[PDB]
Design a protein around this ligand. Structure first.
Ligand SMILES: [Mn+2]
Ligand code: NA
Length: 191
DNA sequence: ACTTTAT
DNA sequence: ATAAAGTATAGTGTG
Protein backbone atom coordinates (compact mmCIF):
# COMPACT_ATOMS: atom_id res chain seq x y z
CA UNK A 1 0.00 0.00 0.00
CA UNK A 2 1.17 3.55 -0.81
CA UNK A 3 1.47 6.32 1.85
CA UNK A 4 -0.98 9.08 0.83
CA UNK A 5 0.20 12.52 2.04
CA UNK A 6 -0.79 15.73 0.28
CA UNK A 7 -1.21 19.33 1.37
CA UNK A 8 -3.54 22.09 0.47
CA UNK A 9 -3.02 25.81 1.19
CA UNK A 10 -5.71 27.30 3.46
CA UNK A 11 -6.68 30.98 3.65
CA UNK A 12 -9.34 32.92 5.67
CA UNK A 13 -11.72 31.90 2.82
CA UNK A 14 -11.70 28.14 3.03
CA UNK A 15 -10.96 27.72 6.74
CA UNK A 16 -14.59 28.37 7.64
CA UNK A 17 -15.58 25.50 5.34
CA UNK A 18 -12.77 23.27 6.67
CA UNK A 19 -14.00 23.95 10.23
CA UNK A 20 -17.68 23.36 9.57
CA UNK A 21 -17.07 20.10 7.74
CA UNK A 22 -14.20 18.74 9.89
CA UNK A 23 -16.51 19.12 12.95
CA UNK A 24 -19.61 17.69 11.23
CA UNK A 25 -21.43 20.93 12.08
CA UNK A 26 -24.83 15.63 3.12
CA UNK A 27 -21.90 14.23 1.06
CA UNK A 28 -23.12 10.84 -0.26
CA UNK A 29 -20.17 8.91 1.25
CA UNK A 30 -20.51 10.27 4.78
CA UNK A 31 -22.25 7.74 7.06
CA UNK A 32 -23.85 9.99 9.70
CA UNK A 33 -24.32 6.96 12.03
CA UNK A 34 -20.54 6.80 12.22
CA UNK A 35 -19.78 10.46 12.69
CA UNK A 36 -19.74 10.00 16.50
CA UNK A 37 -16.67 7.74 15.84
CA UNK A 38 -14.50 10.56 14.48
CA UNK A 39 -11.95 12.12 16.88
CA UNK A 40 -9.55 15.02 17.21
CA UNK A 41 -5.88 14.51 18.18
CA UNK A 42 -4.85 18.03 19.23
CA UNK A 43 -6.36 19.29 22.50
CA UNK A 44 -7.91 22.32 20.76
CA UNK A 45 -11.24 23.89 21.87
CA UNK A 46 -14.15 22.35 19.93
CA UNK A 47 -16.04 25.71 19.92
CA UNK A 48 -13.24 28.00 18.61
CA UNK A 49 -12.94 28.20 14.76
CA UNK A 50 -9.67 27.47 12.90
CA UNK A 51 -9.39 31.01 11.57
CA UNK A 52 -9.82 32.49 15.05
CA UNK A 53 -7.39 29.90 16.58
CA UNK A 54 -4.58 30.42 14.11
CA UNK A 55 -4.89 34.20 13.70
CA UNK A 56 -4.63 34.67 17.49
CA UNK A 57 -1.67 32.28 17.62
CA UNK A 58 0.35 33.97 14.86
CA UNK A 59 -0.40 37.55 16.03
CA UNK A 60 0.46 36.66 19.60
CA UNK A 61 3.85 35.17 18.52
CA UNK A 62 5.07 36.99 15.39
CA UNK A 63 8.36 38.96 15.34
CA UNK A 64 7.12 41.65 12.95
CA UNK A 65 4.76 44.51 13.90
CA UNK A 66 3.10 44.46 10.50
CA UNK A 67 -0.34 42.83 10.02
CA UNK A 68 -0.85 39.34 8.59
CA UNK A 69 -1.59 39.84 4.85
CA UNK A 70 -5.21 39.32 3.66
CA UNK A 71 -3.99 36.62 1.23
CA UNK A 72 -1.73 34.81 3.78
CA UNK A 73 -1.55 31.02 3.98
CA UNK A 74 -2.81 30.57 7.56
CA UNK A 75 -2.22 26.82 7.36
CA UNK A 76 -1.27 23.96 5.14
CA UNK A 77 -3.85 21.19 5.52
CA UNK A 78 -2.25 17.77 5.08
CA UNK A 79 -4.43 14.79 4.20
CA UNK A 80 -2.82 11.68 5.75
CA UNK A 81 -4.15 8.28 4.54
CA UNK A 82 -3.53 5.16 2.45
CA UNK A 83 -5.92 2.70 0.83
CA UNK A 84 -8.77 0.53 2.12
CA UNK A 85 -6.62 -2.64 2.31
CA UNK A 86 -4.10 -0.94 4.45
CA UNK A 87 -6.65 -0.10 7.20
CA UNK A 88 -8.48 -3.35 6.90
CA UNK A 89 -5.48 -5.05 8.50
CA UNK A 90 -5.53 -2.77 11.63
CA UNK A 91 -7.80 -2.60 14.69
CA UNK A 92 -9.00 0.58 16.41
CA UNK A 93 -5.88 0.94 18.68
CA UNK A 94 -3.51 0.64 15.74
CA UNK A 95 -5.46 2.88 13.41
CA UNK A 96 -5.30 5.54 16.16
CA UNK A 97 -1.54 4.92 16.52
CA UNK A 98 -0.99 5.33 12.81
CA UNK A 99 -2.43 8.84 12.85
CA UNK A 100 -0.65 9.80 16.02
CA UNK A 101 2.59 8.60 14.44
CA UNK A 102 2.07 10.71 11.26
CA UNK A 103 1.11 13.62 13.52
CA UNK A 104 4.38 13.10 15.34
CA UNK A 105 6.53 13.31 12.21
CA UNK A 106 4.96 16.74 11.53
CA UNK A 107 5.35 17.84 15.18
CA UNK A 108 9.03 16.87 15.15
CA UNK A 109 9.89 18.43 11.79
CA UNK A 110 7.80 21.67 11.94
CA UNK A 111 6.99 22.25 15.63
CA UNK A 112 4.45 20.60 18.01
CA UNK A 113 3.20 24.08 18.49
CA UNK A 114 2.12 24.40 14.81
CA UNK A 115 -0.36 21.55 14.61
CA UNK A 116 -3.58 23.61 14.68
CA UNK A 117 -5.91 20.62 14.31
CA UNK A 118 -5.65 16.87 13.61
CA UNK A 119 -9.01 15.57 12.73
CA UNK A 120 -9.51 11.85 12.05
CA UNK A 121 -12.45 10.88 9.89
CA UNK A 122 -13.79 7.32 10.25
CA UNK A 123 -17.17 8.10 8.76
CA UNK A 124 -16.17 8.35 5.10
CA UNK A 125 -14.88 5.65 2.67
CA UNK A 126 -11.39 5.13 4.27
CA UNK A 127 -9.85 6.32 7.47
CA UNK A 128 -7.99 9.61 6.87
CA UNK A 129 -6.83 12.63 8.87
CA UNK A 130 -7.16 16.38 7.99
CA UNK A 131 -4.18 17.94 9.84
CA UNK A 132 -3.56 21.68 9.83
CA UNK A 133 0.09 22.64 10.05
CA UNK A 134 0.66 26.35 10.69
CA UNK A 135 3.73 27.44 8.55
CA UNK A 136 5.17 29.52 11.40
CA UNK A 137 8.93 29.62 12.06
CA UNK A 138 11.44 32.19 13.39
CA UNK A 139 8.57 34.33 14.41
CA UNK A 140 7.44 34.34 10.75
CA UNK A 141 4.35 32.94 8.97
CA UNK A 142 5.37 31.72 5.52
CA UNK A 143 4.20 28.61 3.72
CA UNK A 144 6.60 29.71 1.01
CA UNK A 145 9.55 29.35 3.40
CA UNK A 146 8.38 26.10 5.00
CA UNK A 147 6.91 24.02 2.14
CA UNK A 148 8.89 24.50 -1.05
CA UNK A 149 9.60 22.13 -3.98
CA UNK A 150 12.34 20.37 -2.02
CA UNK A 151 10.49 20.02 1.21
CA UNK A 152 7.62 18.27 -0.60
CA UNK A 153 10.09 15.88 -2.42
CA UNK A 154 11.76 15.29 0.94
CA UNK A 155 8.46 14.43 2.66
CA UNK A 156 7.54 11.96 -0.09
CA UNK A 157 10.80 10.04 0.59
CA UNK A 158 11.04 10.59 4.31
CA UNK A 159 7.51 10.28 5.69
CA UNK A 160 6.79 6.72 4.41
CA UNK A 161 10.15 5.44 5.69
CA UNK A 162 9.50 7.06 9.12
CA UNK A 163 6.08 5.34 9.22
CA UNK A 164 7.64 1.94 8.37
CA UNK A 165 10.16 2.47 11.10
CA UNK A 166 7.23 2.39 13.50
CA UNK A 167 5.89 -0.91 12.23
CA UNK A 168 3.59 0.48 9.54
CA UNK A 169 3.88 -1.36 6.24
CA UNK A 170 3.50 1.28 3.47
CA UNK A 171 5.74 2.16 0.54
CA UNK A 172 6.54 5.66 -0.77
CA UNK A 173 4.82 6.87 -3.98
CA UNK A 174 6.39 6.71 -7.43
CA UNK A 175 9.39 9.09 -7.63
CA UNK A 176 8.86 11.85 -10.17
CA UNK A 177 5.25 10.74 -10.35
CA UNK A 178 3.49 11.91 -13.49
CA UNK A 179 0.05 11.99 -11.85
CA UNK A 180 -2.01 15.16 -11.66
CA UNK A 181 -4.14 15.51 -8.52
CA UNK A 182 -7.92 15.24 -9.03
CA UNK A 183 -10.31 17.04 -6.61
CA UNK A 184 -12.45 14.55 -4.68
CA UNK A 185 -15.42 15.25 -7.02
CA UNK A 186 -13.26 14.77 -10.17
CA UNK A 187 -11.78 11.55 -8.72
CA UNK A 188 -15.26 10.03 -8.04
CA UNK A 189 -16.19 10.11 -11.72
CA UNK A 190 -12.84 8.34 -12.44
CA UNK A 191 -13.60 5.62 -9.79
C1' DA B 1 11.12 35.12 -11.45
C1' DC B 2 7.59 38.19 -11.12
C1' DT B 3 3.47 40.42 -8.51
C1' DT B 4 0.85 41.63 -4.45
C1' DT B 5 0.83 43.34 -0.01
C1' DA B 6 1.31 46.39 3.91
C1' DT B 7 4.09 49.38 5.24
C1' DA C 1 10.61 52.57 -1.94
C1' DT C 2 11.24 48.12 0.27
C1' DA C 3 10.90 43.39 1.13
C1' DA C 4 8.57 39.48 2.91
C1' DA C 5 5.40 36.44 1.21
C1' DG C 6 1.86 35.65 -2.43
C1' DT C 7 1.80 32.27 -6.95
C1' DA C 8 3.15 25.60 -7.35
C1' DT C 9 5.38 22.31 -5.62
C1' DA C 10 4.92 15.97 -4.38
C1' DG C 11 2.38 12.27 -3.84
C1' DT C 12 -2.50 8.56 -4.42
C1' DG C 13 -7.20 8.06 -3.67
C1' DT C 14 -13.62 7.94 -3.48
C1' DG C 15 -9.91 13.15 1.50
MN1 LIG D 1 -12.66 13.80 5.78
NA1 NA E 1 5.89 43.15 -11.40
Amino acid sequence: SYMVARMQKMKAGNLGGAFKHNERVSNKDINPSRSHLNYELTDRDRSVSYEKQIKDYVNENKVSNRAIRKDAVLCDEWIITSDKDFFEKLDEEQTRTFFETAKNYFAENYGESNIAYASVHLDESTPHMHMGVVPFENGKLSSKAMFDREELKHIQEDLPRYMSDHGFELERGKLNSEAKHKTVAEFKRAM
